[PDB]
């Protein structure tokens, strides 16, 4: 009868409890970790596959230099990433298990997702079939619906920020540019191929940019390249603001229509931003075969599952220059990160 859904609830609840109960409390841990590999780098730090010595559990630890963040005046964005990650809760959002900080660095310890970024699989495959891209796009749509319901804008949608877990589902990562926006915001951020026209025009924008990004994402996933690709960034921006997009011949009619409605330069005509909102996308003919409830419950069988070999295997990840992380004997920028 209905007793099996109780067993499913109990199993998911035990997984959640274990994942809560083994991590250290916030700002209580020290470098008590074996550092295995760098999974990505940025202006102020890196993300490392990491093994907690006392537990043997593996995580992805984002390490950030406090001095570098302060010198480039990016305190608010890093605090935003930590606060948003610790405040949200959704199946397709990466989980922040715990966090700490020392004399030099900020540490955001997240769940480890061994399947790698979607960008790697897309580059090695060439492009996804339209059902594959639809499987990914439905999760992105639900995630944006949740986030926008929370008045949050993601602002960093790109194939590199979408990890694939062992079940083939998406884990959205990198929230350094996510921001709780009531009304408008003006910050220039995001990769050039995914920038919305209102961002390029420096006009002030809202959550609609996310939906624009989705269009781009879908296009890329279905074509193997972004819609406004060019060699120089200036031509990329010219093509983005031009209001013109050419689709490959293999694109179906429904996909072309959806993309034409998502890539609307006019904010007042872009899907996701209209009166019906996200429903305008969820009721589109391209998504007619999509069981939104089943996708949310992760009951749909994925079209692609990465080949794994246990936690600690990083074959699905690119290789980066490994560095030694040193912590000063003196505390840097303490009052600046008192809320972290
Ligand atoms: C132009 C660059 C400017 O860089 C900043 C700009 C602004 C800023 O302010 C907030 C910054 F801090 C920075 C940074 O320094 C920064 C340091 C490292 C990374 C990074 O590694 N990115 C990965 C590469 N592609 C996806 C990312 N993957 C995960 O995040 C992740 C998470 C959990 C996971 N679990 N399993 C796998 C797994 C993966 C990104 C930025």
UniProtKB/Swiss-Prot annotation:
Q: Which residues are modified to Phosphoserine?
A: 129, 328
Could you say which EC number(s) this protein's record lists?
A: 2.7.11.11
Q: What is the effect of changing residue 194 to A?
A: Loss of allosteric regulation
Phenotype upon changing residue 191 to A: No phosphorylation
Q: Which GO terms describe its molecular function?
A: ATP binding; cAMP-dependent protein kinase activity; channel activator activity; magnesium ion binding; manganese ion binding; protein domain specific binding; protein kinase A regulatory subunit binding; protein kinase activity
Q: Which Gene3D superfamilies has this protein been placed in? A: Phosphorylase Kinase, domain 1, Transferase(Phosphotransferase) domain 1
Which tissues and organs express this gene's product?
A: Isoform 1 is ubiquitous. Isoform 2 is sperm-specific and is enriched in pachytene spermatocytes but is not detected in round spermatids.
Reported modifications of this chain: Autophosphorylated. Phosphorylation is enhanced by vitamin K(2). Phosphorylated on threonine and serine residues. Phosphorylation on Thr-187 is required for full activity. Phosphorylated at Tyr-320 by activated receptor tyrosine kinases EGFR and PDGFR; this increases catalytic efficiency.
Supply the PROSITE patterns for this chain.
Answer: AGC_KINASE_CTER, PROTEIN_KINASE_ATP, PROTEIN_KINASE_DOM, PROTEIN_KINASE_ST
Please name the SMART domains in this protein's record: S_TK_X (SM00133), S_TKc (SM00220)
* A Pfam family matched in the record: Pkinase
Family from the record: Belongs to the protein kinase superfamily. AGC Ser/Thr protein kinase family. cAMP subfamily.
State the name under which the record lists this protein. Answer: cAMP-dependent protein kinase catalytic subunit alpha
Originating organism: Homo sapiens (Human)
């Amino acid at each position: 009868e209905q007793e099996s859904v109780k067993e499913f609830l109990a199993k998911a609840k035990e997984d959640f409890l274990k994942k809560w109960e083994s991590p250290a409390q916030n700002t209580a841990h020290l470098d008590q970790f074996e550092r295995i590999k760098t999974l990505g780098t940025g202006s102020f730090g890196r993300v490392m596959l990491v093994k907690h010595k006392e537990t043997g559990n593996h995580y992805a630890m984002k390490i950030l230099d406090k001095q570098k963040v302060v010198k480039l005046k990016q305190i608010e964005h890093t605090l935003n990433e930590k606060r948003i990650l610790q405040a949200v809760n959704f199946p397709f959002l990466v989980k922040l298990e715990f966090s700490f900080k020392d004399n030099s660095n900020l540490y955001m310890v997240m769940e480890y997702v061994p399947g790698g970024e979607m960008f790697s699989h897309l580059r090695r495959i060439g492009r996804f079939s339209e059902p594959h891209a639809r499987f990914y796009a439905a999760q992105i749509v639900l995630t944006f619906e949740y986030l926008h319901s929370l008045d949050l804008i993601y602002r960093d949608l790109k194939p590199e920020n979408l990890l694939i877990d062992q079940q083939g589902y998406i884990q959205v990562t990198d929230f350094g540019f996510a921001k709780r926006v009531k009304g408008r915001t003006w910050t220039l951020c995001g990769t050039p191929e995914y920038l919305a026209p209102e961002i390029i025009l420096s006009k002030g924008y809202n959550k609609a940019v996310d939906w624009w990004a989705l269009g781009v994402l879908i296009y890329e996933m279905a074509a193997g390249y972004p819609p406004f690709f060019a060699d120089q960034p200036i031509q990329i921006y010219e093509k983005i603001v031009s209001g013109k997009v050419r689709f490959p011949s293999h694109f179906s009619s429904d996909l072309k229509d959806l993309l034409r409605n998502l890539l609307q330069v006019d904010l007042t005509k872009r899907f996701g931003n209209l009166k019906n909102g996200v429903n305008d996308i969820k009721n589109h003919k391209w998504f007619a075969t999509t069981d939104w409830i089943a996708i949310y419950q992760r009951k749909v069988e994925a079209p692609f599952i990465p080949k794994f070999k246990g936690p600690g295997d990083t074959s699905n990840f690119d290789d980066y220059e490994e560095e030694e992380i040193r912590v000063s004997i003196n505390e840097k920028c303490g009052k600046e990160f008192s809320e972290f």
